[PDB]
Design a protein around this ligand. Structure first.
Ligand code: MG
Ligand code: MG
Ligand code: MG
Ligand code: MG
Ligand code: MG
Ligand code: MG
Ligand code: MG
Ligand code: MG
Ligand code: MG
Ligand code: MG
Ligand code: MG
Ligand code: MG
Ligand code: MG
Ligand code: MG
Ligand code: MG
Ligand code: MG
Ligand code: MG
Ligand code: MG
Ligand code: MG
Ligand code: MG
Ligand code: MG
Ligand code: MG
Ligand code: MG
Ligand code: MG
Ligand code: MG
Ligand code: MG
Ligand code: MG
Ligand code: MG
Ligand code: MG
Ligand code: MG
Ligand code: MG
Ligand code: MG
Ligand code: MG
Ligand code: MG
Ligand code: MG
Ligand code: MG
Ligand code: MG
Ligand code: MG
Ligand code: MG
Ligand code: MG
Ligand code: MG
Ligand code: MG
Ligand code: MG
Ligand code: MG
Ligand code: MG
Ligand code: MG
Ligand code: MG
Ligand code: MG
Ligand code: MG
Ligand code: MG
Ligand code: MG
Ligand code: MG
Ligand code: MG
Ligand code: MG
Ligand code: MG
Ligand code: MG
Ligand code: MG
Ligand code: MG
Ligand code: MG
Ligand code: MG
Ligand code: MG
Ligand code: MG
Ligand code: MG
Ligand code: MG
Ligand code: MG
Ligand code: MG
Ligand code: MG
Ligand code: MG
Ligand code: MG
Ligand code: MG
Ligand code: MG
Ligand code: MG
Ligand code: MG
Ligand code: MG
Ligand code: MG
Ligand code: MG
Ligand code: MG
Ligand code: MG
Ligand code: MG
Ligand code: MG
Ligand code: MG
Ligand code: MG
Ligand code: MG
Ligand code: MG
Ligand code: MG
Ligand code: MG
Lengths: 101, 151, 98, 115, 206, 79, 127
RNA sequence: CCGGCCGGGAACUCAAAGGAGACUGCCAGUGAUAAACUGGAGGAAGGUGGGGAUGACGUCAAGUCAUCAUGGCCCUUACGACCAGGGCUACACACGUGCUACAAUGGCGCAUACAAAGAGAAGCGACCUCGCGAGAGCAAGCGGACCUCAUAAAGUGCGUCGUAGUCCGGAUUGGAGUCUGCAACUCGACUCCAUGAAGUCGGAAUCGCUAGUAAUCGUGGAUCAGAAUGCCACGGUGAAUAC
RNA sequence: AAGAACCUUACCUGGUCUUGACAUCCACGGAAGUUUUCAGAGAUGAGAAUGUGCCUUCGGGAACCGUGAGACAGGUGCUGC
């Protein structure tokens, strides 16, 4: 699913773990109902855009690891709906037999 | 079913008037599976009927249901080619059930106030045969009587 | 006391794992209640079976996570050390808790 | 039964009587009768004139009828003069709150037309 | 296309899971990716060594890989030198330690992957698809098979329109769930295109 | 509408406006930030908002304050 | 002394104890009159106590959880018929012929894949 | 102190495993001395007991080259590649599939009873306190039969409206907000307030459904920062009819 | 499509890059990194400080970073006849 689209996603993962998995203090702690509500809260949201557009974990689409398909994802397996099926009935996901109740 | 001759399910008696005839009537009146709302209306109707009529409930419901009961109904078979009116003697299980539908179907219309009022007034008119349900039986006879030429 | 809880995917791999952990504890240094079962977690997944269109057609999968408890009611010196460094049983997760 | 601009109902509960006033609904009407000290179960025929005069001063607090109609008319007319996205939406006769305009929108767009 | 994967329907009943490990919901996805990374790598590296399936286990941060194979000599090489070369490179991408074990298979013609890869290899060297298919069907019935359905889909023999052809000899009950059936597929990348090679091998009734 | 924690403008547009206002009136500012709100200090400026293919000049008035810049720049043309 | 019968009509699971004494019917510490109100049938629990008469013979301490009204009320009916085993096969000859001891398995059907709810298919477009 | 709270208890519900069990197996009758079958016992269950998975050879050169793989044929200071916005949400119209209606078996208020199946660690987030409410703080506990989202709603029980475009519908608009999120105007969801459109059961047509099924009332999950009336599951009350 | 505000996004506008965002090499210079400032819509470009490690053939290393060079990398472009 486009090697550029797969390769631009590695920036999104690597660069997010750098900034906002550490510098969420800029938005969370500072922008709060307390004594910093005056210019300190203004300088927070001002400085929050100085950061790159990426880094925000909302910008991560969360696509399949094998193929790179954006849609049809499953968080348990980290795979697309097609590749989980191909892998399940084959012997790769442990315990994942066909359900029938 | 094409060749699957199986019987029907058993029903249950209504606590306050433990029988069968009016137990079916609750079921035909019931909308959206709400037997709690429907069964309260039938008791409210038959109590208001028994007050006015000066009878019990089962015999009050009977002298009413028989007055809207079809003797013969009209089918139409094409045996040979053409389509014509063939009357047939209705079966005893369907006979009284087809009557209970015509009482309730009439009571959908005739917007008095409440459902308990409307069924009471329909069964009251059925006792003195001058409602809508008796007219629907009357018309059903007129077809069988007029189209009696076809066996 | 030590509440030992252990879970797995196969229903008939965990049985000998629960049998051997109890026997290497009951026999070596006494005391055991038994294999307390607990409810099974059945995480279901309903994926689309085709690669394009055909929404009606799907396959349904599940993963039975079978739990088990052990529950000993005395901190025995022979038993407590037999739990550590002496488990094995692959495909069966185990979590000892004091 | 003559408060505010209009309000002339009869054989209707006091809470439902004041819904007919433009600028007063269900919950506002409960706040009127709570402040006035009148029961919601009574009706205007049952009430006396001594109690109706207290309702007149209570609804005078809130913006109602011709005061409200102009406040809404000002706000819509303001948007159209600015030439904003909502102003273009209003004067063109199309739905405003980011709605679907392709299949539906019949309330705002009006009934069906020929092609 | 409307048939269930014969291995998959029997994963609880008769056939086993190849990846046999427990993991909590957090690690599960990353643990399954590293499982695919070694499997993809180890299959392509050990091509001539002739691997059927790869079983993987993970008891308490220790990845025990098992390579079921027809030719165990080519996997190990000389004095188990290639085992140590595999041990190192597999351990890096996967997760800390390694424990590669090699299971021999004295009846290689009854394993579905090895028959499919043999037919694939033959199709790539300009051998007739019938002479590759029927000979493989004939070879394993004499040894110890009771089924052996073999389908070959695609262009085959440089044709314009693609055809699907199959030749079986015996009982191959795909519907029977108690029945053990080795099923496997392989693609044959020729000059004309891709040629699929599905193989079913009914061994035992239970 | 959203955002109680300070009305939002992009750093670049804030600094560009502050630099433009202190100097004096000049020309339409090429800005792509539609998302940004309009401050009281922006009144008088004829900033050019990006509709998508071109820049639409918008003379900011007393009323155009709480509204955002993209409201005065129709994207999809019709008839 | 104190006999027992299970009953578990439709998810719900009754737990009927029965002793020889007063005519009362206790259930979850509530009275039978107030626990089961106007709904459809209170006396489905008392249906099995008709061919074998109660009146003032057998007191019933009941406990139930699961289902709703009729699921519980029907589970108590099955629970009582199972519980009435103190005169083994003499009662069950007359009791079985009027239904009663039949579990009546019928549970809610699962939602099918593709279909809108169990049997209800969506619609049909033929152009 | 009066709540499974308490020691404790191992009966029962349940939870799991491993077994019993329904076998036309018994019983008569129709049959051809057969396969069968009509009922009848016994039984929790009766003739594949209900439901699921399971999909033969092959049909439609059916769908997918945009999941992936892939033979050719094509592009390479571009059909490749990074960024800010805009767009996929456009709107004389036409249909599909829904949902909410058009009410009185109903609508709004107060007294309060009964589920299942899930799900949760940058998670799900009590009780408290601030909120008219979305929510805002503090933060308890739980990788869970325990802790949490979580009061199920239908349903009763009282009240009140009394057939009105209505106390039906709840659209649409204006204002005031809330959380998420760098950012909510194009283009979110929800809340409050006022607003109160069409609609009074639908032309030719036409759809699904054979019992816990239709019908109706909740509820969950997957994808998911946020964003279901969809989808996938779950359980309540519970019909008619099959000559 | 198991959920389009940016992302996704394959489309459009304008800005932009050509061994490229993603890869192994032949080899030139540097630890990797981290903090922080300026012009710009942002991609980017310009800096300013600090740190200067696991083995010595010590003209080297095993990674990482940024140059020039080509084998090339890359295409959700067409063809499900
Ligand atoms: Mg690719
Ligand atoms: Mg997203
Ligand atoms: Mg389909
Ligand atoms: Mg369809
Ligand atoms: Mg309102
Ligand atoms: Mg309100
Ligand atoms: Mg809306
Ligand atoms: Mg729109
Ligand atoms: Mg094919
Ligand atoms: Mg199938
Ligand atoms: Mg134009
Ligand atoms: Mg059960
Ligand atoms: Mg019997
Ligand atoms: Mg089905
Ligand atoms: Mg249902
Ligand atoms: Mg269709
Ligand atoms: Mg049609
Ligand atoms: Mg049609
Ligand atoms: Mg047609
Ligand atoms: Mg026989
Ligand atoms: Mg036989
Ligand atoms: Mg016999
Ligand atoms: Mg004979
Ligand atoms: Mg005979
Ligand atoms: Mg014989
Ligand atoms: Mg015989
Ligand atoms: Mg026989
Ligand atoms: Mg029988
Ligand atoms: Mg029978
Ligand atoms: Mg049989
Ligand atoms: Mg059978
Ligand atoms: Mg079956
Ligand atoms: Mg059978
Ligand atoms: Mg069976
Ligand atoms: Mg079968
Ligand atoms: Mg075609
Ligand atoms: Mg077609
Ligand atoms: Mg098709
Ligand atoms: Mg492709
Ligand atoms: Mg090519
Ligand atoms: Mg060529
Ligand atoms: Mg050429
Ligand atoms: Mg071109
Ligand atoms: Mg679309
Ligand atoms: Mg929308
Ligand atoms: Mg025109
Ligand atoms: Mg239409
Ligand atoms: Mg209302
Ligand atoms: Mg309603
Ligand atoms: Mg759970
Ligand atoms: Mg709580
Ligand atoms: Mg509270
Ligand atoms: Mg409120
Ligand atoms: Mg806040
Ligand atoms: Mg909180
Ligand atoms: Mg705990
Ligand atoms: Mg506790
Ligand atoms: Mg919830
Ligand atoms: Mg609680
Ligand atoms: Mg709550
Ligand atoms: Mg509570
Ligand atoms: Mg109610
Ligand atoms: Mg009006
Ligand atoms: Mg009208
Ligand atoms: Mg509204
Ligand atoms: Mg109105
Ligand atoms: Mg009306
Ligand atoms: Mg209709
Ligand atoms: Mg209706
Ligand atoms: Mg039709
Ligand atoms: Mg039909
Ligand atoms: Mg059927
Ligand atoms: Mg409703
Ligand atoms: Mg709701
Ligand atoms: Mg739901
Ligand atoms: Mg969730
Ligand atoms: Mg829903
Ligand atoms: Mg719904
Ligand atoms: Mg973009
Ligand atoms: Mg361009
Ligand atoms: Mg290429
Ligand atoms: Mg390509
Ligand atoms: Mg193109
Ligand atoms: Mg085709
Ligand atoms: Mg094909
Ligand atoms: Mg096509």
């Amino acid at each position: 699913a486009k090697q550029s689209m797969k390769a631009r996603e590695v920036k999104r993962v690597a660069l997010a773990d750098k900034y906002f998995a550490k510098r969420a203090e800029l938005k969370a702690i500072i922008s709060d109902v307390n004594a910093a509500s005056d210019e300190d809260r203004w300088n927070a949201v001002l400085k929050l855009q100085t950061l790159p557009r990426d880094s925000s974990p909302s910008r991560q689409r969360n696509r399949c690891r094998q193929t790179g398909r954006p849609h049809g994802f499953l968080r348990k397996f980290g795979l697309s709906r097609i590749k989980v099926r191909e892998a399940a009935m084959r012997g790769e996901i442990p315990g994942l037999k066909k359900a029938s109740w | 079913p094409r060749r699957r001759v199986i019987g029907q399910r058993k029903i249950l008696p209504d606590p306050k008037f433990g029988s069968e005839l009016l137990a079916k009537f609750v079921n035909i009146l019931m909308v959206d599976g709400k037997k709690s709302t429907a069964e309260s209306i039938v008791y409210s109707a038959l109590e208001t009927l028994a007050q006015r009529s000066g009878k019990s409930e089962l015999e009050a419901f009977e002298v009413a249901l028989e007055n809207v009961r079809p003797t013969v109904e009209v089918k139409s078979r094409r045996v040979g080619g053409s389509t014509y009116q063939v009357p047939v003697e209705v079966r005893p299980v369907r006979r009284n059930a087809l009557a209970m539908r015509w009482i309730v179907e009439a009571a959908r219309k005739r917007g008095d106030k409440s459902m308990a009022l409307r069924l009471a007034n329909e069964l009251s008119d059925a006792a003195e045969n001058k409602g809508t349900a008796v007219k629907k039986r009357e018309d059903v006879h007129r077809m069988a009587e007029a189209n009696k030429a076809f066996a | 006391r030590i509440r030992i809880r252990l879970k797995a995917f196969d229903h008939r791999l965990i049985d000998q794992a629960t049998a051997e952990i109890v026997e290497t504890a009951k026999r070596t240094g006494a005391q055991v209640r038994g294999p307390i079962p607990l409810p099974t977690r059945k995480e279901r997944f309903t994926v689309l079976i085709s690669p394009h269109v055909n929404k009606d057609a799907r396959d349904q999968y599940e993963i039975r996570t079978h739990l088990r408890l052990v529950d000993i009611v005395e901190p025995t010196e022979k038993t407590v050390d037999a739990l550590m460094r002496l488990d094995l049983a692959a495909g069966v997760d185990v979590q000892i808790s004091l | 039964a003559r408060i505010a601009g209009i309000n002339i109902p009869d054989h209707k509960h006091a809470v439902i009587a004041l819904t007919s006033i433009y600028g007063v609904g269900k919950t506002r009407s409960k706040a009127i009768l709570a402040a006035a000290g009148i029961a919601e179960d009574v009706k205007i025929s049952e009430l006396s004139e001594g109690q109706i005069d207290t309702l007149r001063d209570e609804v005078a607090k809130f913006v109602v009828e011709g005061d409200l109609r102009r406040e809404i008319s000002m706000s819509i007319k303001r948007l159209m003069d600015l030439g904003c996205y909502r102003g273009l939406r209003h004067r063109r006769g199309l739905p405003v709150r980011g709605q679907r305009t392709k299949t539906n929108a019949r309330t705002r767009k009006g009934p069906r037309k020929p092609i | 296309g409307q048939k269930v994967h014969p291995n998959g329907i029997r994963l609880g009943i008769v056939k086993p899971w190849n990846s046999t490990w427990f993991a909590n919901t957090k690690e599960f996805a990353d643990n399954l990716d590293s499982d695919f990374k070694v499997r993809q790598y180890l299959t392509k590296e050990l091509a001539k060594a002739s691997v059927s399936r790869i079983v993987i286990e993970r008891p308490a941060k220790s990845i025990r890989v098992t390579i079921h194979t027809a030719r165990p000599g080519i996997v190990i090489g000389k004095k188990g030198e290639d085992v140590e070369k595999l041990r190192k490179v597999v351990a890096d991408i996967a997760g800390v330690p390694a424990q590669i074990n090699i299971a021999e298979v004295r009846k290689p013609e009854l394993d579905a992957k090895l028959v499919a890869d043999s037919i694939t290899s033959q199709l790539e060297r300009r051998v007739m698809f019938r002479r590759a298919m029927k000979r493989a069907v004939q070879n394993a019935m004499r040894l110890g098979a009771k089924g052996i359905k073999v389908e070959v889909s695609g262009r085959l023999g440089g044709a314009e329109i693609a055809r699907t052809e199959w030749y079986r000899e015996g009982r191959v009950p795909l519907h029977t769930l108690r029945a053990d059936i080795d099923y496997n597929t392989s693609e044959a990348h020729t000059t004309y295109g891709v040629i699929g090679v599905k193989v079913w091998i009914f061994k035992g009734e239970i | 509408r959203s955002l109680k924690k300070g009305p939002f403008i992009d750093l670049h547009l804030l600094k560009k406006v502050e630099k433009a206002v202190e100097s004096g009136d000049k020309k339409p500012l090429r800005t792509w930030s539609r998302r940004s709100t309009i401050f009281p200090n922006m009144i008088g400026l004829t900033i050019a908002v990006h509709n998508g293919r071109q820049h639409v000049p918008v003379f900011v008035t007393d009323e155009m304050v709480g509204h955002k810049l993209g409201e005065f720049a129709p994207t999809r043309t019709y008839r | 002394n104190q006999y027992y019968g299970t009953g578990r009509r439709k998810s719900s699971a009754a737990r009927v104890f029965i002793k020889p004494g007063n005519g009362k019917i206790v259930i979850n510490q509530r009275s039978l009159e107030q626990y089961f109100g106007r709904e459809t049938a209170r006396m489905v629990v008392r249906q099995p106590l008709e061919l074998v008469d109660m009146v003032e013979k057998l007191d019933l301490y009941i406990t139930v959880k699961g289902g709703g009204i009729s699921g519980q009320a029907g589970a108590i009916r099955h629970g009582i018929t199972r519980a009435l085993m103190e005169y083994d096969e003499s009662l069950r000859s007359e009791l079985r012929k009027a239904g009663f001891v039949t579990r009546d398995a019928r549970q809610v059907e699962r939602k099918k894949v593709g279909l809108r709810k169990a049997r209800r298919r969506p619609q049909f477009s033929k152009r």
